[model samples]
Target: ASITEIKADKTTAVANGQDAITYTVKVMKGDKPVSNQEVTFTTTLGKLSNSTEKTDTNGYAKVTLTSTTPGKSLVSARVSDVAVDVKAPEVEFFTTLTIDDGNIEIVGTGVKGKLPTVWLQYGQVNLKASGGNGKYTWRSANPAIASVDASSGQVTLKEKGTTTISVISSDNQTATYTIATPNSLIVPNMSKRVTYNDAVNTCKNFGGKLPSSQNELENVFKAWGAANKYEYYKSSQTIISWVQQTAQDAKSGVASTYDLVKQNPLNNIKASESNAYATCVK
Candidate 1:
C-alpha cells in the first residue's frame, strides 16, 4: 500500500510560541488501510514535534508544528516506501498585530498631554495599560523628575520638570506617556481687601470663582503643594479672606460668610461684614 493522503488540522495558527498545528499522514492501498508504515515529517519555518511517526492500525501518522516566529512555513511529510508524490499537508503562521479592541496605551481619566495635578505626589498614580499583551515592562525616562515602577506601572513624581514614562508588552508592543508641569487652578487674586460681593467678582474675571466651600479651600492648599508656590498664595491666607459660600445668623438675620484661613495661623470661620482679602480658584 502507498501513502495516500497527508493533511493538517489547521491551515493557520498564531505565532505566540505555544499554538500548534497538527498534521496527519494517512496510508491506504486499493480501498484498504495499511498499517506499520513509516512516515517522516519536516518543516522549514517552525519545529515539528516529531521527526518520524509510524502509521497506527488505521494507517495514520500524526505530528504537530509549533513555533515562536511569525511567518510562512512549509510543512512536508513523506513515506519511506513510496517515492511518488502524495497530497501533502501545509501550514502558515501569522501574527495578530492589531488587537480587536485597540492598541496599547497608558490610561487615565485626566491628562491629555500631561499627568494630572491630583495624580502628582499623591498615590503615585497607577498608569494602567489599556490594551496589549498581559506581560508588561514599565520604564521612566528620567527618574529625577518622575518614575514609573518597572513591573507595577505606578508613576511617582520627584519634583518639577519634564519626563517620560512608558510600558512595553511581551510582544514588543509599546505605549509611552510624557508628563509636564500641571496647570495652575488658582487664579491671581485681587490686590486689595474687598467686600463679599466684590470677592466673588475678583475671581469671575480671572477665569475662576472664589472657593465656595471649606473643601474647595483645602483643595487650594493642595494646589499650592503641587506648584511649590505656597508662599505666593498662602500669603493671602495670612489675612482672613472671604469665600463664595455665605450663611445668615438666625437670631440677628444678618449674613455671615466663610473665610479662608490656616497654615501659618490658627484658622476658623469669620463673618461677612468686615474687610477680607480675596483669591480666585480657576
Candidate 2:
C-alpha cells in the first residue's frame, strides 16, 4: 500500500480563529517505507494544502489545515503509491449584537442581507417582520424593553437597560440585537462662523473645540468623507452653519472670501449689500 490511511483532527464542530484539522498518512509497501513517493493534499473548496511529499524513513506524510469561518471543508492526499482523502469539520457563524438604548445599534454582519418573513423569538416577544433587508421588530402586542424600526434599521429604547434581542432573517441568520441605555449625544455639524463665541459654543455642543485652522478642518472633512462612504460626490448628513458677519469694506472681505472658499460652506454665499453669510458643512 503506497498510500496510507487518512485521518483528521475531528469530523465536525469547529470554532473560529485557531481551529484547524490535521491529516496523517502512513505509507506501506509490503511493511516497508515507500521512500521518495510524492503526495498531494487538497481541500473540498479547491484549497490545496500541500503537494509532492517524499515519504520519510517512517513512511508517513502529515498535513494540517486551519479554518477561520464555518464551512464544509475537505482534505485529500494522493500519492503515486496510494490515494486517500479526509473531510474536515464545518464551521458556523458566531455572532454578537450591540446597541445603545435601541437608538444607536450594531448588528451582526451575518444578518445584513437576509431579511425575515416571520417573527423571531426574543424573550416572550416574537419579533415581527418589516420591509427592507435584515429588518425585523417585535410584535406591537408583545411587550419589549426596546423598540426598533425594522424597516429603517432604527431602534429606540422604551426603558434603559441591557438585554439580548434575537432577530432572525429569511436565511436563518440569527442576530442578537443588544439593548443598552441611551446616554450619549452626537451633535450635528455646524458650518463655519466669523463669530468666535458662536464657533466655540458650537464646538462645545458637539463635544469638542472649535476648528480654527485648515488642519482642524480636516476632522470635519474626513468625517463627512467617511459618512458618505468615502464618496467625494456624495453629501454627508452632518452639515455646519457659520455665523454671518458683514464688513463695511467689501474689498477687505474678498481676502476673507478666499478663506471662505477654503471652508467649502454647504450653503451658497449670501452677498448682502454690507454682509456675507455662508453655510459650511464638511
Candidate 3:
C-alpha cells in the first residue's frame, strides 16, 4: 500500500537562538500506522536534527529544528516514494526607533512632547502630533483648570490644579496631554487713577473683585504697597454712613468709605468726591 500522509506536530519557532524545537512526523497508510518507514527531512532555512530517520513501531519519526537567520523556514518530511506536507514556521517581528532629541521615541503612536508638571505662571504651551494623516483636534477635561484650542493644540492654563488634554487625529488615533498648576499666586503691579465706578468695571474685566471686608482691603493695600502711601481702593458693598435722618434728609444716606490707610474710622471718606487708586485683586 502507498504511504497516505505525513504530518508534523509543531509548526513555529524563533530563529537565531539556541532554542531547539523538535517536530515529530507521523507516516500513515490508510487508518493504520506504517512501521519501518524511512522518512527524509529537509528545510529551506535552519538545520534539521537528522536528515533521515526510520519510523518507529507507531510510524513516528522525530527531528530537532534550528536556525541562525531570521524569516520563515519551511520544513518538509516525506517518505521515499510519496510527496508529503511542508510545515512553515514564521520568525517573530521587531521594530526600532532612534530619537535625536535624546527623549523617548515611539514608532506607531500618533503624538509626543507631553510633560509631567507645568506652572500656572507660565500661561500656555503648544502640543504637537505626528505619524498619521495631518488633521488634528484638541480638548481639555476641565476648562476651569486649563483650556485647549481644537484646530491648534495650544493649551491655556486657567488656574491651579491638574487637568487632561486630549489630541485626536483624522483616523481617530489619540494622545493625552496631562498638565498641572501650582498653588502660587501672581499679582500684577497696577496703579491707575480711576473713579469708583470705572475701577469696579475694570477689576471685573480682569477677573478681579473689590475687597469684601475692611481687613481684606487693608491686607491687599499693604501687599500692594498702597496702605503706607495712603492710597484708597473700593469695596464690594455700600452702607449708609448715618442712621438718623430728617424727613427731607430721609430720602438718602451718605455712602460709607472703604479706607485702608488709617486704623481709625474717622479717617474714611465718602465715595463720589474721593481721589482713589485702583488695585484689582485676582
Candidate 4:
C-alpha cells in the first residue's frame, strides 16, 4: 500500500433532519488539519455528494447533504485517496415542512453564533425568529417563494412557488435548499425498481423531458444521484434510465450525459428539489 492517510474531524454539528445533514471534513496526513483538498461523499441509499474547498486557518471545512425523500438516513463520505469513513454520525432526518399563511418555520439544533438568512430569488418574506439561544426576527425583500432572516437564522415561505434558497450563515457557511409551494410538484422515486417507461413518464409528469443522449442520460442520473445523495457515488445506475442518441428520439435531440446541467434552469418544482441539495445555486 502507498500508506495514504487522512482523518475526519467533527467540527460543528447540526441536529439531524430530512432537510439537511452537516459535517465538517478535515484532512490530516499528519498531526495538523490538511488544507486545499478535494473531498467527495456519497450515501449508500442513493446520490453522490461532492465538495472541494480549502481548509480555513483552523484547518477545517464543512460539507453537507440533504435527502429528497426526507426522513432518517445513513450517509457516507470519501476524501479522495486519503481515507474513507462511512457515517461519522447517524442522522434522524425529518422533512415535513409546512407553510402557515405563506409563512414557514425551520427548526434545528446547535444554531448559536451563526446568523441564518432566508432568501428567495424572486421576492422576500416576513420572518420572525424566536427560540434557541440566538433568537431574533426580521422581514426580507420581496422573496420569490422562500425567505430567511440571516441575522437570526429563520427561514420561511412567502408565496406558492418554487426556487432554491441558500441559508447564508454569518460564518459564511451555507445550507442551500428548494421549497415547493403546497401541491406544486410531485416527485417519484426513480430507483432500480422503476421500469423504463414509468421512468420516462415520471420525468414527464414532473415537467421534465426524457434525456436524449447517452451523455444526457448519464447527466440526468448523475445529477439526480448527486442531488439525492446516494449511498455510493456512482454515476451509472440501472434504476436511472439513459436513452441513446439516435433517429428514434431526434425530436428532443441527444443530451450530453456529461454536460452537468445546472438544476432547475426553468425554476419549477423539480428545480426546487434539485436546488435544495445544491451548495452554490442561487
Candidate 5:
C-alpha cells in the first residue's frame, strides 16, 4: 500500500489563538483503503496534539493545527515511506479603525480617507477585525505624536502634533489614517455689557440669544470661569414665574421680577435677586 494524498478540511484560521483546523490524511494503495496504517503529522508554525496516529478503517488520519503567530505555515502528513503537504492558512483579521474624536471623520468603505485639519490634544482609536481574528499588524509614522498596537488595535495620541497610523490584516487588507493638531486662539469679549433686554437685543444682533435656564447659566459660569471679562450675566427666565395680584396693604400690585444671577454671589438660591447683568450666547 502507498500513501497518495493528504488534505486539510480548512484553508484559513486565526493565529496562536483558540479555534483550529483538522487535516485528514488519506493513505491509499491504488485507490483502495489502507486502514490501520500509522500516520505522522508536522507543522512549521504550530504543534500538533498527536505526532503519530493510526488511520481509521477507511484510511483516514486526522490532526489539528494551531498557531500563535501571524504568518503562513505548512503541514505535512507521512505514512510509511510516503508523505504529502497540505496548506494550513492562518490569517490576522481587522476591518474597521475608529478614531475617538468628535472632529475626526471617517471617509470611504473599509475606512480609507480622513478629513483634513483634525485638531486634538490627545486622542485614541480602536481596531476591529471582521471575523474575530485577534492578530493585526500596527505601525506609526511618529511615536511622539501617535502610535498603535498591532495585537490590540489600541491607538494613542502622544501630544499636540501630527502623525500617521497604519494597520494590516493577515490577508493583506490595510487601513491608514492621518491625524493632526492645529494652533488656534480664543477671542475675548466678543460682546459687551447691556441691560437684560439690551443683552437679548445684542445677542440677536450677533445671531445669538441669552442663556435661558438655570442650567444654561451654570454652563455659562463654567465656560467663563472668571477668565472671561463678564462673570455676572442674565438668563431669559427668572427662578420663578411672575404672578399678578395686589398685596394686602397695597392698592394696586406690580408684576414681580427677579434677575438670573451668574456667580450665584450668595452661593445658593437665596442670593438670586435684582440688578443682574447679561452675557449672551448662541
Candidate 6:
C-alpha cells in the first residue's frame, strides 16, 4: 500500500489576519506509519506554513494556513507524483469589514458585512466581498453622491440621499446595501418671497427636503459645501434658513431657523416664515 489520505487539524476559518487552520496529513503504508517521508502541502487560497514537510516518526506532516480574502478552497497534499485524497471536504472562507473614518469611529460587522439597510453621518465606508467566483464588481444606485470601485468594492462618500451599494460577484451574485446620507445643495432664486410650504415642495421637487436640523444644516451642509462656493454653492444672502424640526418651542405655527454660513442656529425661532434663503438636501 502507498500513502493513502490527507486531513486537517481544523477545516474552517474567517479569512482575516487572525484565525489560522492547521493541516496535519499522514503518510501511511497499511496500518504502519511511514517515517521520514516528504510531503508537499498546498492551498487554493492563502499561504501555507510549509510547502514541503517531512513526515515524522508517526507519519504525520503538518502545515498551517492563513488568508485575507474569502472563498471555498482546498488544502491539498502530495507525495512525489501521487496526490493524496483529503479526508475533509472543501474549506470555506468568509469575510467582514472595517468601518473606520480615521478618528471618530471604527467597527466590524457581521459575516460578509451584509448590511441590507444603513445610514451614513459623514466620511466613507470601505467594502470587501467573498463568495461566488472570488472576483467582485461594485456599483452604487445613486452615483451623484458616491460611487464604487468596480474591482476593489470600495465606496466613497459625497452626500445627498439614499444609495444602494451592490457588490456583484463574477458569477453574477450580489449583496445588497442601502445607505441614506443626508446632503445639502442650494436652491437658485430662493428668497424671502418663498413660502414655507413652497420650500418644502420645492426642495422635494429638487429631490431633497429643507435642511432638517442644526447639525445637518450647520455641521453637515456647511462643511460639505464649504468645499465649493456659488454655482455649486448657495446662500449667505440671508443669515437664516428653515429647519424641519417640529416648530421650535411647542407649536406648529412656527419652525426653527438656522444659519448655514455662520454655522449656528437662529437667535430666535420664526413663525412659519419663508424670508430665509432656501436650499435642499436629501
Instruction: Indicate the worst ten consecutive residues by lDDT in candidate 3.
Output: 93-102
Local distance difference test, candidate 4? 0.37
Which candidate number maximizes TM-score?
A: 1
Please give the TM-score that candidate 2 achieves against the real structure: 0.32
Preferred candidate (TM-score higher): 3 or 4: 3
Model 5 per-residue lDDT tens digits across residues 214-279: 454443233323222222112222232111112421232222222222244221221122223343
Decide which is better by lDDT, 3 or 5. Answer: 3
Clashes of each: 0, 15, 0, 37, 2, 0
C-alpha lDDT score of every prediction, in listed order: 0.59, 0.40, 0.49, 0.37, 0.47, 0.58
Error of 2 at 53 (Å): 2.4
True-vs-predicted CA distance for residue 249, candidate 5, Å: 32
* Superior by lDDT: candidate 4 or candidate 6: 6
Task: Please list all clashing residue pairs in model 1, or write none if there are none.
Answer: none
Lowest-lDDT window of 10 residues in candidate 5?
A: 241-250
Task: Tell me the tens digit of each residue's lDDT in model 1 across 1-282.
Answer: 776777788776767677788888888887888788888776788888888888989999898888777777887777776665454555666553332212222232222232445222222455667434467788888987777679887765655567877787664556677777654344434367766566777677766676665455555444323222223333444444565554433233222333333422222333344466665654
| Residue-by-residue lDDT tens digits, candidate 4, 1-282 | 111332233222223223345666565666666666556565543222444445555556565665444333455556657584545555533323222222333232221322223222121232332221222323334365556655653554444566655433221133444454443211224233333344455666655544444443333323132322222222322222233224533344321112122232221112212212111111
Against the true structure, what is each candidate's TM-score? Answer: 0.40, 0.32, 0.32, 0.27, 0.38, 0.37
User: How many clashes would you count in candidate 3?
Assistant: 0
Candidate 4: deviation at residue 47, Å? Answer: 6.1
What TM-score quantifies how close candidate 5 is to the native fold?
A: 0.38
Q: Which is better, 1 or 4, measured by lDDT? A: 1
For residues 68-184, could you state the per-residue lDDT of candidate 3 as single tens digits? 654456677677666764553432211111111222111112223433232212234556655323567878889887777788766655567788877765533466656655433
